[PDB]
Amino acid sequence: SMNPPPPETSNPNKPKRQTNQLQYLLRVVLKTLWKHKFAWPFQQPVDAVKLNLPDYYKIIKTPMDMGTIKKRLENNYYWNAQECIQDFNTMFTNCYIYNKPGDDIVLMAEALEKLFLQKINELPTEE
Numbered sequence: 001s002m003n004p005p006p007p008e009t010s011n012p013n014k015p016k017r018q019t020n021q022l023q024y025l026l027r028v029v030l031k032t033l034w035k036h037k038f039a040w041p042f043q044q045p046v047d048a049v050k051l052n053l054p055d056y057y058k059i060i061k062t063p064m065d066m067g068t069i070k071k072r073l074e075n076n077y078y079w080n081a082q083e084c085i086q087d088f089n090t091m092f093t094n095c096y097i098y099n100k101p102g103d104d105i106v107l108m109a110e111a112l113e114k115l116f117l118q119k120i121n122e123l124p125t126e127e
């Protein structure tokens, strides 16, 4: 089966900016989910080999994880906050697609998503 390369975390042909929303996404939103007790399985791409999940990248063709999101924020990969929020949504949806309901990992994703939405609700205004 084997893993794909991780998602892109840099792009030399994309302009860059630091904004209030992006800073909040790293310092408050990502930081808060990162330190959650359920965070670790989502802190890096799913290693289908080590975990023995050979069909993972057959089923999930748009992988995403918080390690990638963190690196994207640190590398100024996102221009719009929406890009980052979309990546979180993709991560959670992947989990709901690949795993079975009631799997420990699905409940963990549910709790993390609730927390995520709580924090996105207090995102500072665009400007």
Ligand SMILES: COc1cncc(-c2cnc(NC3CCNCC3)c3[nH]c(=O)c(C)cc23)c1
Pocket (backbone or CB within 6 Å): 040, 041, 042, 046, 047, 051, 053, 094, 095, 098, 099, 100, 103, 105
């Ligand atoms: C360091 O990464 C991990 C740590 N702990 C757990 C996982 C993990 C394990 N199993 C998964 N799926 C199986 C659960 C039991 N039923 C068959 C599928 C996982 N699925 C996922 O989507 C993620 C993100 C982690 C994971 C990854």
